[PDB]
Amino acid sequence: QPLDCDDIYAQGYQSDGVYLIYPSGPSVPVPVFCDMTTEGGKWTVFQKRFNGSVSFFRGWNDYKLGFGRADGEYWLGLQNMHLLTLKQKYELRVDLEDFENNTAYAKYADFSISPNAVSAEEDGYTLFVAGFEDGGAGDSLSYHSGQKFSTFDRDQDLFVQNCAALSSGAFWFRSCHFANLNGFYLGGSHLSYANGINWAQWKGFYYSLKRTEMKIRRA
Amino acid sequence: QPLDCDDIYAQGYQSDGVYLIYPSGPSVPVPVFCDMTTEGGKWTVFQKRFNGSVSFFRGWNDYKLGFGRADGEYWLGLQNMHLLTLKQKYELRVDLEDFENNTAYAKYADFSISPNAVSAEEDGYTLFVAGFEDGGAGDSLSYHSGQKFSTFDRDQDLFVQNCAALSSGAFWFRSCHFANLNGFYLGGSHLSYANGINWAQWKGFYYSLKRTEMKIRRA
Amino acid sequence: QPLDCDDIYAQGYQSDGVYLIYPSGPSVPVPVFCDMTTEGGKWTVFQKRFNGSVSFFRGWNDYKLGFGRADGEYWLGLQNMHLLTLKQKYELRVDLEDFENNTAYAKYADFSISPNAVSAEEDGYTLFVAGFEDGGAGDSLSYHSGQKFSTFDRDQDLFVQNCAALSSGAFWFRSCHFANLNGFYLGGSHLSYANGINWAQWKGFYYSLKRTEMKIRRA
Amino acid sequence: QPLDCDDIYAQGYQSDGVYLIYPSGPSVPVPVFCDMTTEGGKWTVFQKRFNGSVSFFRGWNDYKLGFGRADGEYWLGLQNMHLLTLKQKYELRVDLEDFENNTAYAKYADFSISPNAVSAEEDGYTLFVAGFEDGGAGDSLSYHSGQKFSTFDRDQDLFVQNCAALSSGAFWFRSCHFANLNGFYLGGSHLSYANGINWAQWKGFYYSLKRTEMKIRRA
Amino acid sequence: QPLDCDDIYAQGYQSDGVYLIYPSGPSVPVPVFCDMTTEGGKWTVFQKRFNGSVSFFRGWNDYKLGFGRADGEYWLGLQNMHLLTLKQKYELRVDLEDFENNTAYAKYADFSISPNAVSAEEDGYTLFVAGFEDGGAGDSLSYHSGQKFSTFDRDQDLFVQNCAALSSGAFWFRSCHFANLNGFYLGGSHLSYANGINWAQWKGFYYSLKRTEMKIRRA
Amino acid sequence: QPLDCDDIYAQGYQSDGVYLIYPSGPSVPVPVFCDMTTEGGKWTVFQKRFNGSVSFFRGWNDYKLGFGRADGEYWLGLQNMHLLTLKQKYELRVDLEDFENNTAYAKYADFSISPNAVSAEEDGYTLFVAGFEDGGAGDSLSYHSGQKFSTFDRDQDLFVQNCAALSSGAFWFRSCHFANLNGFYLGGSHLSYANGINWAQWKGFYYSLKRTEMKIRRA
Amino acid sequence: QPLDCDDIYAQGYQSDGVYLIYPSGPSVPVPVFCDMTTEGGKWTVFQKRFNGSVSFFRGWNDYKLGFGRADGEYWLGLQNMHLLTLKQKYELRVDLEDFENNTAYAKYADFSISPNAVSAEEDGYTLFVAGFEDGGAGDSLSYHSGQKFSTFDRDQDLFVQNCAALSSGAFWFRSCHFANLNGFYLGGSHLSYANGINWAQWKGFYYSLKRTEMKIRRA
Amino acid sequence: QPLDCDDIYAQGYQSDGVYLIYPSGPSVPVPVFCDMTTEGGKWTVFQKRFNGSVSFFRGWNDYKLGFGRADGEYWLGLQNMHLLTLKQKYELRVDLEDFENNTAYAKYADFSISPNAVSAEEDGYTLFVAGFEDGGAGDSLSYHSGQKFSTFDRDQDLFVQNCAALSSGAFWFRSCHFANLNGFYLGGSHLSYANGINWAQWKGFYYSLKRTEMKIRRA
Ligand SMILES: *[C@@H]1O[C@H](CO)[C@@H](O)[C@H](O)[C@H]1NC(C)=O
Ligand SMILES: *[C@@H]1O[C@H](CO)[C@@H](O)[C@H](O)[C@H]1NC(C)=O
Ligand SMILES: *[C@@H]1O[C@H](CO)[C@@H](O)[C@H](O)[C@H]1NC(C)=O
Ligand SMILES: *[C@@H]1O[C@H](CO)[C@@H](O)[C@H](O)[C@H]1NC(C)=O
Ligand SMILES: *[C@@H]1O[C@H](CO)[C@@H](O)[C@H](O)[C@H]1NC(C)=O
Ligand SMILES: *[C@@H]1O[C@H](CO)[C@@H](O)[C@H](O)[C@H]1NC(C)=O
Ligand SMILES: *[C@@H]1O[C@H](CO)[C@@H](O)[C@H](O)[C@H]1NC(C)=O
Ligand SMILES: *[C@@H]1O[C@H](CO)[C@@H](O)[C@H](O)[C@H]1NC(C)=O
Ligand SMILES: *[C@@H]1O[C@H](CO)[C@@H](O)[C@H](O)[C@H]1NC(C)=O
Ligand SMILES: *[C@@H]1O[C@H](CO)[C@@H](O)[C@H](O)[C@H]1NC(C)=O
Ligand SMILES: *[C@@H]1O[C@H](CO)[C@@H](O)[C@H](O)[C@H]1NC(C)=O
Ligand SMILES: *[C@@H]1O[C@H](CO)[C@@H](O)[C@H](O)[C@H]1NC(C)=O
Ligand SMILES: *[C@@H]1O[C@H](CO)[C@@H](O)[C@H](O)[C@H]1NC(C)=O
Ligand SMILES: *[C@@H]1O[C@H](CO)[C@@H](O)[C@H](O)[C@H]1NC(C)=O
Ligand SMILES: *[C@@H]1O[C@H](CO)[C@@H](O)[C@H](O)[C@H]1NC(C)=O
Ligand SMILES: *[C@@H]1O[C@H](CO)[C@@H](O)[C@H](O)[C@H]1NC(C)=O
Ligand SMILES: [Ca+2]
Ligand SMILES: [Ca+2]
Ligand SMILES: [Ca+2]
Ligand SMILES: [Ca+2]
């Protein structure tokens, strides 16, 4: 059974659209969007935003099990990505676009979630990335990694000691920085601090992007 | 293994009775009733009523997992119908019968439950039907679709704002019309408003039917 | 200390406005509106509506302990009225007005809540009324009495057996009748059945009033 | 303020009816029934049965706070009896009546509930009776005393070790004898073992009585 | 994989002892005792008692999932027996022995648990038996069947209405009868009513047996 | 008994120290600090900070009942302030001091908490202040009033719609301005936005003060 | 009403036995043992042990509200002692006896519980003692004080960091020392570390005493 | 699929590193560490410590599911070890090392967890070891076996009766000896009793070891 979009690239399915993958056994498949157009196909997607629509506040269960629709905006789910990356090696790519027409992207050579954990949930779905290659966006994930996933209803204890105020965000946080792609959908610019879709290296802490997309591919 | 009644029709088992199907793996089958005598066989049945007996009030867990008996009245369960419809395409048929001796039916070209959701339970098991084909009963499911399943204990909060009073029903609702085939079992006619087994197009909002049956078939 | 508006009528306070009463000891008083203008003063008020403003859906705790503001719309609370009527004899009066300018009223000679109960909450705050005297509104409370108070989150079991659908109302209910002064605030008229501020004897089941007020007085 | 029926006997109120007593402060009185016609008046009543009506199954909260009506059948409540007996000494009288026309009675010289406990609820509302005086009914409370109150939901754990089956009763128990005056209301005679209103000394374990009444008086 | 002791009788394992069976897939097997000595082998066992040791009070989860040890006393579990009997036809046999040396047995031609239920737990694991053949013990299970399984922590509502006192037993109960093989382990005889290991047809309501064993076999 | 510091000023107790007050009956007094040296004595104090020590994060229960020490920093409690202000009229004074050596103050003519609510807790302990009188600090409480008390665990739902991020503060809020005197204890100046002890009119949103004190007096 | 044994020493009650005191209003009194024999009377007791009998494991609620019997062993309750010491000044005395006949005692000039706390429970019922005067037992409470009360079900977090293992004791703990008079009742000597009734200054960490008693008196 | 390190030794993978094993079906593998260099390879490792790092306090869920990292310190999990040992026989080896430079080891001929239980969790994951073979460390697991697993939150009730104080440990206990290899990480020597990593036979109850490792192998 096809584990990812790589096996879908075989058996002559070199097209674009929603398919089925089998990350946790031959039963209960999952629909996912494979982008076979950019460089050579593959590029399994696990995040997508282009307009307001689906809200991204959510909680621990919703991030562990996934939400959204496959043809629109969605988040695959930490459990599924962990089960995928436990078996095979992979590689991460992130591309994003602001309001005008502007474009940029970034590439990382290695990507995994809780590499050698006996129980992935008990560790907390930590991040790992290595081998940054620029594309005009900058390195904003290498400072992280080694940090567990977090939410607004889980943690809210060590943040109040080291920093002030509550996080109210879902990403791999290292310090008091509150910039991530899982924030609220604001317009072109905002006056508040980092609470929208922010990529600090490209635009800054006062510009919320238009489209986000994170993909992985075997290497 | 057989997935539904269409595979039961093969291996020379063309008859009318309770069989076994395997929607969620080779283990733990489910007994169901296939009505192989109307048009061409197949016609997997996920709802049945002919007298009072089984009560249909229930809650979210019961409608998610299923209740009743295979030979009498029952409800297959939203989870199993979702698992069936995800893999293969289908087509919906409804046939109904008044108290005196009359019968009617309706047909829909496409039937699916939460088509492209990463998690079906988070979406709410929405309905989708298109391609109506008249048979003397009218169109009473096209106005809906795009709406989620609600019960008397899950939601009961957005209804008291637009409308008054509580719903106390189990169907895909769109507005304050509270007539559905999963209501109470009253006599031929009643003075209260739509709170029995009502099909709005055929009889109206003041007549509770005698027998109901919903069947799906591969197209 | 003044227990009710009768003691406030003494010590030369024969005016109209918000005062203080001491129903449960010399500590923790309660503000209440005394209407000393209609016939001879007194007339302690325990209900008031004149526009939408305060919602009346509420629950068991909110009806047991009271809610609202004294200068506007409010509900005193079953505990306070029980403590008042346990000590002294009283008498009930209800007056109401529709949209135009129309007026009417009704009078009852006796009023009490759980007269001889060892534990008032365990009985359920039953109603008692005797000696109806007409004023142009009719008798719509004598059919009740002997019936416990009810709500939408308490009961919802014996209603489904005897009647269909859920109550979603707060009053002393005897049968499947769903007309009371603690319903939703609709306009002059509505198409739905009794779910607004309905007094069946005066207007009917399709007219929601404008103003309601229930008072008590010693006799 | 009057504390019990003994103070009601003064101020010229020698009669038979429901009065008010103040066991827990000058506020929040409790209505009770004083039987001032048997020997010398007084005789505060904390239990009454003459027909089926009120059910006596109940739980720990109900027996702690009290249930029933003052004119009919009721249970005063362990808390109020404890508060009464703590301040003043008393004396217990029980009178009972079979179905046909017969009557009997018993007398105890001293009655108290949890005499010298810092917290009565933690002790379990133990019983203490001494100085039996025969009247034709026998001694059925001297074997007990020193034992705490138990119910069908509080304890139900030490009984399944010494004896078999569950208790489902509300009295001060000593061993596997499960006969008490707070049982079910059966007819004159029954085939099952002691599970009705049984007084072991007078009739036996196979006869459920018709009327019960427990009264206390100052000594 | 071997589903029961019948497949174990194949592949040349015609011996007596603890084996493994696969009732719910090729993973997570179950150890069970097969009695290949009486008539022709097979005879999968799902109950065993010969001395006090393991207690049988337990609850709903413990009866649904099973308890005990395979070489001693144990109860297989309603889920496992349901999964077994859903697939293949079977036949029930019960044999028992009192204190002296005495023996007896009974046979039933048909045995199943929730035959045509869409969700077995929702029905309640009902019993079915047909075709009694005597062996000196009598028919004491045909009066039952059609009745759901029950326990001391589940039900305790309809028993108090129809009968008095609490059940405190685990079997398929039809009326106020409290005799079953899942009771307390008493000696040869007892003075209390049916609360030990009682088979009413053979000995009576005052004799608790020594050994019990219930087996099933394909037919 | 003394109700506040105004009655403490009488009976010849004009001094500065911790005394006892009786807001909720003759029993269970509360120790408080009266500052009888500024203008005319009285000046009951319900808030105090001069260094870090006590933490002010807390929750709804702590702000309802009160925390801290009488001689150091503390919070009197919304319940006691409500009980005090309900009986008598009062008048609010606030005095504040920057880090270097500067001081300022403000005065309000009328101060009350939930003026005419039947139940204060259901209203939310709203604020009401009128009649500002400048002293060099500015008006920072007139924009509020009519708003209820909120915390980081009670509400946190209407804020994420109008504004972004969570509040994590304890004051009467009106809009997304999150500056109040019950924040964190930072140094003289900080780079983050208003999350310390900020008084907007005097210094701004980037300076956390050194000492705070709120006092009320009878008018 | 008599607040303590000092008022009982008035009105000519200079005897020894169980009396009543009124620490929280004129209602709900408390029985207590006053020792008017040692030096000059008074000596209100709040702890007593002379044999095994009553267990002292208990929890937070049992220590807050009190337990035991007044004529035997008991613990008054932190709430009652706090209410007593809030109003009047007092003085503490402790005396104890080992197995043989040996005796000793200690005296402290000042004793209080949460002196200036706005909410006593929120602080945690801290200890204060000053002015030690020897009597042959030594000073073992001055090292403590300023430390909150603790139990086995409350805390169990900071103990695991600073020390190892769980406390399982009820006293005012300062460091890893586990010697107190609220431990288990062992014989004359034991081999384990401090887990019995230990007073380190007199006997040591391996000797459990015979009798304990703590009293207070006004000064 | 490989079930343990013994099948990893085949297919030419004789090395030392982290591999994958399939104890609960073909899906969801678990990463583990095989130490293929001591005697003959194999030697699956289900415990590892060499410095402080990971904390071993934990609870019942963590010990049931497993925690830690494959390359560092970890605990495999009672469920997976039970699943492994149920299918095949094994043999236990323990090797330990003091702080200075010394090492030792012990061997047991048979190792299993809950051998013949219908439900392993209900039994408590009991231990069974036989056939000790000395290597210079002594026998410290033969006294146990037949005992269930206990933690600081599961049981903590039968211990306070036989012994004093709470356990706060995770091992198979028999009596009040509280020395096990899953304790706290202290230095070379400590003054407190057995609460670190203690092996009683080799060093004693006052020395916490440096490195631990438990391995099993097929026999
Ligand atoms: C957002 O995009 C989705 C993509 O299908 C579309 O369905 C939806 O209408 C869009 N919403 C708005 C407000 O543009
Ligand atoms: C972005 O591209 C679109 C082309 O569809 C154009 O209409 C728009 O003006 C561009 N934006 C800017 C800022 O030029
Ligand atoms: C309802 O139909 C079922 C069909 O299985 C039948 O068993 C039952 O007796 C019927 N009930 C009545 C009241 O006719
Ligand atoms: C309906 O058909 C049945 C046939 O079973 C017949 O007995 C009955 O009279 C018919 N009734 C009507 C109203 O047509
Ligand atoms: C409703 O009446 C109250 C009475 O004070 C008033 O404050 C409020 O503004 C009114 N609301 C509307 C919508 O008229
Ligand atoms: C009711 O009285 C008011 C007087 O303020 C008047 O304006 C209104 O027209 C009256 N309503 C009708 C229906 O005449
Ligand atoms: C039981 O006695 C009460 C006395 O108040 C009476 O009201 C009721 O009707 C009686 N019930 C029956 C069934 O006789
Ligand atoms: C009991 O006394 C009543 C008097 O009300 C009488 O009618 C009845 O016959 C008597 N019965 C017996 C058995 O004495
Ligand atoms: C009960 O039987 C089992 C069977 O193995 C045995 O282990 C146990 O010792 C027996 N107990 C008694 C009390 O005879
Ligand atoms: C039952 O059989 C055994 C044989 O081991 C014998 O010892 C015993 O006496 C028999 N019982 C009776 C009542 O004879
Ligand atoms: C804070 O002030 C209090 C005043 O009671 C004082 O006891 C404490 O030591 C101070 N803390 C610091 C860190 O100065
Ligand atoms: C503030 O006043 C203090 C007096 O205690 C003085 O020591 C300090 O130098 C002053 N600082 C400033 C900035 O005025
Ligand atoms: C312990 O002392 C109490 C004091 O009254 C006594 O009642 C009890 O019998 C004693 N227990 C033992 C075991 O000596
Ligand atoms: C303690 O005193 C008692 C007097 O009753 C005496 O019997 C006992 O021997 C004394 N203990 C010792 C150790 O002498
Ligand atoms: C403990 O050992 C681990 C081995 O992975 C190492 O990463 C860590 O730094 C060590 N910690 C210390 C304090 O030496
Ligand atoms: C232990 O061995 C190490 C080798 O790494 C050595 O450096 C150290 O001195 C030795 N210590 C002892 C006490 O033998
Ligand atoms: Ca967090
Ligand atoms: Ca209701
Ligand atoms: Ca039951
Ligand atoms: Ca603690």
Author numbering:
A (entry chain C), B (entry chain F), C (entry chain B), D (entry chain D), E (entry chain G), F (entry chain E), ...: 37 to 255
Paper text:
MFAP4 consists of an N-terminal signal peptide, an RGD recognition site for cell surface integrin receptors, and a C-terminal fibrinogen-related domain (FReD), which constitutes the bulk of the protein. MFAP4 multimerises and interacts with elastogenic proteins, including fibrillin-1 and tropoelastin, and with cells via integrins.
The presented 2D classes were collectively used for initial reference generation and subsequent 3D reconstruction using C1 point group symmetry, confirming that MFAP4 organizes as an octameric structure. Further refinement of the 3D cryo-EM map with D2 symmetry produced a 3.55 Å resolution (masked Fourier shell correlation (FSC)half-map = 0.143, Supplementary Figs. 2 and 3) structure of octameric MFAP4. Thus, the top and bottom halves of the MFAP4 octamer, defined across the central XY plane, can be described as two tetramers, each composed of two dimers with N-termini linked by C34 disulphide bonds. Within the tetrameric top and bottom halves of the MFAP4 octamer, monomers interact through intra-tetrameric interfaces, including potential salt-bridge interactions between interchain residues R105-D159 and R94-E158, hydrogen bonds between interchain residues A106-N152, G104-E158, G104-V154, and R94-E158, as well as non-bonded interchain interactions between R105-N152, G104-D159 and F103-E158. The top and bottom halves of the MFAP4 octamer associate through inter-tetrameric interfaces, including a polar non-bonded interchain interaction between N231-A200 and non-polar non-bonded interchain interactions between V196-F93, L202-L202, S204-L202. Between tetrameric halves of the MFAP4 octamer, the buried solvent-accessible surface area is 433 Å2 and is shared between 22 contacting residues (13 residues from each adjacent chain). Although the N-termini preceding Q37 are not resolved within the map model and are predicted to be disordered regions by AlphaFold2, we observed that the Q37 residues of each of the four MFAP4 molecules at the top and bottom of an octamer are positioned to extend towards each other and outwards from the macromolecular assembly. This arrangement potentially positions four integrin-binding RGD motifs at each of the poles of the MFAP4 octamer (orange residues).
